[PDB]
Amino acid sequence: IETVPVKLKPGMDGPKVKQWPLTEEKIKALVEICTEMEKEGKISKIGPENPYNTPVFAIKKKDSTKWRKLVDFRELNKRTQDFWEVQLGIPHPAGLKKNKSVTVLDVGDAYFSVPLDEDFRKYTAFTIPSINNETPGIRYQYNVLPQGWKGSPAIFQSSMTKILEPFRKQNPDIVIYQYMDDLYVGSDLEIGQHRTKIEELRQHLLRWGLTGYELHPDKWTVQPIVLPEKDSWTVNDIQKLVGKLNWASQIYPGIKVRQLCKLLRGTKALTEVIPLTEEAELELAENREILKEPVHGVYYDPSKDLIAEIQKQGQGQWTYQIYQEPFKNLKTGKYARHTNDVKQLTEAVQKITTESIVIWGKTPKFKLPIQKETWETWWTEYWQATWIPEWEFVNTPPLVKLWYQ
Amino acid sequence: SPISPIETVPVKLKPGMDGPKVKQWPLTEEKIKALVEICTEMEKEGKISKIGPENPYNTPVFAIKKKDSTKWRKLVDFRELNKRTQDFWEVQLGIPHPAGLKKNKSVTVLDVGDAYFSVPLDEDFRKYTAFTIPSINNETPGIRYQYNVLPQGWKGSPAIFQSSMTKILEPFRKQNPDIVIYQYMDDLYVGSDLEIGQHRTKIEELRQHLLRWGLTTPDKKHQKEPPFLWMGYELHPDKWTVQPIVLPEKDSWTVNDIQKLVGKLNWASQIYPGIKVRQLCKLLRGTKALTEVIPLTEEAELELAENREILKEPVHGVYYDPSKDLIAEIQKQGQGQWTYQIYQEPFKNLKTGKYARMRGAHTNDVKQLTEAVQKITTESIVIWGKTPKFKLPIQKETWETWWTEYWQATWIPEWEFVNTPPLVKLWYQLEKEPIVGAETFYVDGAANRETKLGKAGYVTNRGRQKVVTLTDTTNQKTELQAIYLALQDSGLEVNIVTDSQYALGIIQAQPDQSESELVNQIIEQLIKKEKVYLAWVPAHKGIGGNEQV
Numbered sequence: 001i002e003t004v005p006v007k008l009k010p011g012m013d014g015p016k017v018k019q020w021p022l023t024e025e026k027i028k029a030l031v032e033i034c035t036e037m038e039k040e041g042k043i044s045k046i047g048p049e050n051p052y053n054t055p056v057f058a059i060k061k062k063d064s065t066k067w068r069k070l071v072d073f074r075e076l077n078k079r080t081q082d083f084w085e086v087q088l089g090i091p092h093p094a095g096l097k098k099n100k101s102v103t104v105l106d107v108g109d110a111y112f113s114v115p116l117d118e119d120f121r122k123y124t125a126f127t128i129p130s131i132n133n134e135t136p137g138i139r140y141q142y143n144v145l146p147q148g149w150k151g152s153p154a155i156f157q158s159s160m161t162k163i164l165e166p167f168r169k170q171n172p173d174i175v176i177y178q179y180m181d182d183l184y185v186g187s188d189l190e191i192g193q194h195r196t197k198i199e200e201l202r203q204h205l206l207r208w209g210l211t212g213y214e215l216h217p218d219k220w221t222v223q224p225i226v227l228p229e230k231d232s233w234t235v236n237d238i239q240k241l242v243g244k245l246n247w248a249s250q251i252y253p254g255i256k257v258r259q260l261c262k263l264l265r266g267t268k269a270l271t272e273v274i275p276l277t278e279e280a281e282l283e284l285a286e287n288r289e290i291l292k293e294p295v296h297g298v299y300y301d302p303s304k305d306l307i308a309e310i311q312k313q314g315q316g317q318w319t320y321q322i323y324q325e326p327f328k329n330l331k332t333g334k335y336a337r338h339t340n341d342v343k344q345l346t347e348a349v350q351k352i353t354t355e356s357i358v359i360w361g362k363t364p365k366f367k368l369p370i371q372k373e374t375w376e377t378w379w380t381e382y383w384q385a386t387w388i389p390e391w392e393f394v395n396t397p398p399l400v401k402l403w404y405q
Numbered sequence: 406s407p408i409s410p411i412e413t414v415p416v417k418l419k420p421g422m423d424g425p426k427v428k429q430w431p432l433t434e435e436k437i438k439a440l441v442e443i444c445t446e447m448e449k450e451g452k453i454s455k456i457g458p459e460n461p462y463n464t465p466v467f468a469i470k471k472k473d474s475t476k477w478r479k480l481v482d483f484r485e486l487n488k489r490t491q492d493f494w495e496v497q498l499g500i501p502h503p504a505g506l507k508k509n510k511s512v513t514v515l516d517v518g519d520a521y522f523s524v525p526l527d528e529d530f531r532k533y534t535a536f537t538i539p540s541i542n543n544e545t546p547g548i549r550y551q552y553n554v555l556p557q558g559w560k561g562s563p564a565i566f567q568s569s570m571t572k573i574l575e576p577f578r579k580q581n582p583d584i585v586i587y588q589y590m591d592d593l594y595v596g597s598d599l600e601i602g603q604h605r606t607k608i609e610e611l612r613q614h615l616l617r618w619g620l621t622t623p624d625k626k627h628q629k630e631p632p633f634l635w636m637g638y639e640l641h642p643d644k645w646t647v648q649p650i651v652l653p654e655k656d657s658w659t660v661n662d663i664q665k666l667v668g669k670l671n672w673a674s675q676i677y678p679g680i681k682v683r684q685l686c687k688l689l690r691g692t693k694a695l696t697e698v699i700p701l702t703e704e705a706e707l708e709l710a711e712n713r714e715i716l717k718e719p720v721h722g723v724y725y726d727p728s729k730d731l732i733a734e735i736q737k738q739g740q741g742q743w744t745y746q747i748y749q750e751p752f753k754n755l756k757t758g759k760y761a762r763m764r765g766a767h768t769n770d771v772k773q774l775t776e777a778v779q780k781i782t783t784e785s786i787v788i789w790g791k792t793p794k795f796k797l798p799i800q801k802e803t804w805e806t807w808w809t810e811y812w813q814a815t816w817i818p819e820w821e822f823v824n825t826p827p828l829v830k831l832w833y834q835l836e837k838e839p840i841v842g843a844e845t846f847y848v849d850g851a852a853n854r855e856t857k858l859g860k861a862g863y864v865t866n867r868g869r870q871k872v873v874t875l876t877d878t879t880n881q882k883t884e885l886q887a888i889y890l891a892l893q894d895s896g897l898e899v900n901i902v903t904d905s906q907y908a909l910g911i912i913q914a915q916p917d918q919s920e921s922e923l924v925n926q927i928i929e930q931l932i933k934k935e936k937v938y939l940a941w942v943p944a945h946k947g948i949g950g951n952e953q954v
C-alpha cells in the first residue's frame with residue numbers, strides 16, 4: 001500500500017528521549033518480542049546514523065501472563081500533533097458518554113498491516129537496554145504503523161471506517177469511537193444484548209485481522225463536595241465548615257456563609273459547643289443543595305489542555321478533579337481500591353484517563369502526589385493501558401485534601 | 406594496518422548546511438615538511454587519498470612536535486565539520502560497575518590497533534574531510550587530501566566505530582554464547598569460565614575473527630596481565646576495588662586541595678564503608694579563590710581523621726552471582742547523611758555508597774530513609790536489573806504509621822527492621838482532634854511588603870495576649886514566628902489556630918530538621934510539648950478572634 005507522508009511539526013525534530021533502566025526480567029521479555037516483530041518485518045535494527053530515541057517498557061495488561069511491549073510515544077506525539085489532530089483528526093461523539101454501556105476493545109494489532117512512511121521511520125527509533133551497560137542497546141525502528149503513536153489511527157482511519165461500515169449500518173444506535181489502539185463501543189442495550197453486539201463486532205474485526213473491558217458512563221454521577229450532618233456543632237467543626245464553604249465559592253456560584261461566619265465571634269474555645277441559628281441552617285441547606293448540583297458556568301474548551309489532580313485520602317481512598325482552569329471543575333470523583341500506594345495511584349490514573357477519553361476524547365495532564373523518582377521506578381509494575389498520559393509530580397496543599405474529603 | 410571489508414554507515418550533514426570551507430593558515434617550513442611525511446604514509450596505507458582543487462571544502466591542519474620527543478603529529482581541526490555533521494546515537498550510555506560483573510575463570514584484554522583508521526568512511530562523505538597542506542608560503546596550490554577512514558576529532562568516529570565493531574562480533578558472539586565480550590571504547594574484555602588453554606584458544610579464534618575484519622588485536626604475552634587497572638578500579642580475579650587512594654598530609658588546604666580531596670573521597674566510598682564528606686564539603690561553600698587557603702574546622706579535621714582510619718588497610722568488593730538475592734542495608738551516619746552497602750552473602754559486600762541529599766528545606770529521617778531507598782533501588786536496576794531486599798534501621802510500626810497518614814503516595818519494596826542505631830523515628834505527632842481544657846492560642850502574623858517590617862502575636866481564649874515587632878521579615882517568617890510564640894508561652898498542651906497554610910503544611914509534615922532556624926526552634930517546642938492540636942482558618946474572614954489578631 002502507498003504510504004501517507006508525515007511532516008514533523010515545523011522547526012523542530014525527532015524526540016531524543018532517554019531510556020529508563022529496565023529490569024532483567026523486562027529486558028529478556030522485550031528482546032523476545034523484538035526478535036519476533038523483526039522476523040515479521042515490522043521493525044528493523046537501525047544504525048548509529050539514527051540519533052533518535054523513544055522509551056520502551058514491558059507491561060502485562062489486566063488478566064494476562066504474556067508480556068506486552070509498551071512504547072512511550074509521548075514526545076513524538078507532541079512533535080506530530082499537527083498531523084494527527086489538526087490534519088488527520090478523528091471526531092469525538094458526545095453521545096458516547098450518554099450510552100448505558102461502553103466496552104473497550106484493543107485494535108492496536110490493526111496497525112502492522114500498514115506501512116509507516118519510509119521517510120518517517122527514523123523517528124520511531126527505540127533502544128533495548130542492557131544490564132550494567134554490559135553491551136550496546138538493541139536499536140530498532142518502525143517499518144509499519146507503531147502502537148502508541150497517535151499518528152497511527154489518524155492514518156488507519158479510512159481503513160477502519162470500512163471495517164466498521166456494515167456493523168454501523170446495521171446497528172445505527174451503537175457508538176464506535178477509536179482512541180489510539182482502542183475502540184470504544186457504546187449502546188443503551190440490555191447487557192447480554194450489548195455483550196452480544198460486541199462479540200458480533202469482534203467477528204467483523206476478525207476478517208480484517210484485528211482481534212472486553214466494561215463501563216457504564218451514564219452512572220458516573222458526581223462526587224458532590226460534602227458538608228457534614230450532625231447534632232452538636234463545635235467551633236472547630238465550624239471553623240472547618242466555613243473553610244470548606246468559604247473555599248467552595250470562587251468555584252461554586254451563589255455560595256454563602258455570612259450567617260455561618262457570624263456564629264464565630266471572639267476568642268472562643270474550639271472544644272466548646274454552640275447551638276445553631278436556623279438561617280445559617282439554610283446556607284447549610286442552600287449550599288448543600290448547591291454543592292450537589294454541578295457548576296453553573298463551567299464548559300469544556302476543546303482548545304485547552306485538561307488537568308487531573310489527585311489526592312490521597314487514606315484507607316485506599318483517593319480523590320480527583322478534572323478541570324481546564326483551576327477550581328473550574330469539569331468533573332470530580334473519588335476512586336477507592338495486595339494494593340500499595342503506588343499500585344492504587346496507578347489504577348486511579350488509568351481510570352481517570354479512560355473517563356477522560358470517553359467524555360472529551362483527550363487525556364488530562366496528571367498532577368501526581370508522589371516523588372517523580374518513585375513514580376518512575378514503580379509505575380510500570382501496575383500499568384496496563386496501552387496509552388500513557390502526561391504527568392507532573394506535586395505536593396498537595398493541606399487544605400485541598402479535606403476541602404475535597 | 407587493515408581497513409575493514411565491512412559495510413559503511415551513511416553519514417549526512419545537518420539540514421540546510423554545506424561542508425566546511427576553512428582557509429588553511431600559512432604554515433612554517435618544518436610544519437609543512439612534516440605534514441608531508443605523515444600524509445604520504447597515511448595515503449600509502451589508504452587511510453587518505455589525494456584530491457583535486459575542484460573540491461570546494463577544506464578543514465585546517467596543523468602539526469605539533471612532542472615534549473621530550475622529536476616526533477611530529479598532524480592535528481586536523483574538525484570543528485566546523487562537527488558543527489555541521491548530523492548528531493549520532495549516543496555511544497555507550499553508562500559504564501558497567503565492577504560490582505555488576507559476574508565472576509569468570511579467565512578474562513583477557515584486547516585493544517584494537519588504530520581503531521578509527523582501521524574503518525571505512527562513507528564514500529559519499531569523505532568529500533568533506535578535505536584538508537590542505539599549504540605550500541612554502543602563499544605561492545603554490547596546497548596538496549589535497551581527504552579521508553577514507555574515520556578521522557580522529559570527527560563527530561561520528563566513536564559512534565560508527567562502535568557500531569561497526571558491534572556488528573563484527575555478532576557472528577563470533579552467536580557461536581560463542583558462553584563467552585562474554587565487553588566492548589569499551591577501542592577495548593575488548595573477554596571473559597570465560599573455560600579451562601585456561603581452551604580460553605587462550607577461544608581468544609585467538611577471536612583475534613582471527615577480528616583480523617579477517619580489519620581488526621588488529623594483540624597476541625598472548627603482548628596482552629595485559631591482571632590486575633586490570635580499568636576506570637579507577639583494580640580488577641583482580643575474585644575482587645575489585647577503587648584504585649589506590651592517597652590522601653595528602655598537608656600543612657594548609659586551598660579550595661583546589663579540598664576539592665580534589667572530597668573527590669577521591671566520594672570515589673573511595675563505592676567500597677570503603679562510611680566515608681564522610683559533609684564537614685569537608687562545607688568548607689567549599691561560598692568558595693573564594695581556587696588557591697585561597699581554607700583553615701579546616703574542628704569538625705572537618707575529625708571527618709578527615711575518621712576517613713584516614715577507614716582507608717588505612719584495604720577493602721575489596723566481590724562480584725555478582727545472579728543466583729542469589731541482593732541484600733541492601735542502610736544506616737544513618739549523622740547530620741543528614743546515610744550509608745548503605747550491598748552484599749549477596751552476609752558481609753561480603755558487592756559495593757557500598759552514601760546518600761546525603763537535602764531533598765526539601767525541611768524534611769525528616771523517615772523521608773530521607775526513603776529517599777535513600779529509592780536512590781539505592783535505581784542503582785540496583787541499573788547494575789543488576791533487579792531490586793534488593795532492604796534491611797532498614799526503622800520499625801515496621803513506625804513506617805506504616807507515617808506512610809499511612811502522610812499526604813504523598815509512598816512506597817518501599819521488601820524490607821525488614823534492623824536494630825542498628827540510630828533508629829529512625831517520628832519525633833512528635835499532631836493531635837487528630839482539639840485538646841480539651843488546653844489553651845487556645847489564636848496566633849497571627851503579618852509583614853508590611855514596603856517597610857519589610859512585621860508584627861507577630863497571639864490572642865488566647867483565656868484573655869492572655871501578646872504581640873511582637875520583627876525587623877526584616879516576611880509574612881511567611883512572621884507566621885512561623887507567631888506559632889513559635891504561642892508554643893513558647895504555653896506548656897505541655899497547646900491548641901493553636903493559624904491562618905497560614907504555609908506553617909500548617911510545614912509542621913503537618915512532621916519536620917525534624919530544617920534549613921530554617923525558626924523552624925528549627927518550632928521543632929524543639931513540638932518535641933518537648935505533650936499534646937498539640939493545630940488548625941487553620943481563612944484570614945480577613947470574621948473567623949474567631951481572627952478579626953482580633
Ligand SMILES: N#Cc1cc(Cl)cc(Oc2cc(OCc3n[nH]c4ncccc34)ccc2Cl)c1
Nearest residue numbers: 506507508509512594596631633635640641642
Ligand atoms: N580490563 C578490564 C576489564 C574491564 C571490564 Cl569492564 C570487564 C572485564 O572483565 C571482566 C571482569 C569480571 O569480573 C572479575 C573477574 N572475573 N575473572 C577474572 N580474572 C582475572 C581478573 C579479574 C576477573 C567478569 C567478567 C569480565 Cl569480562 C575486564
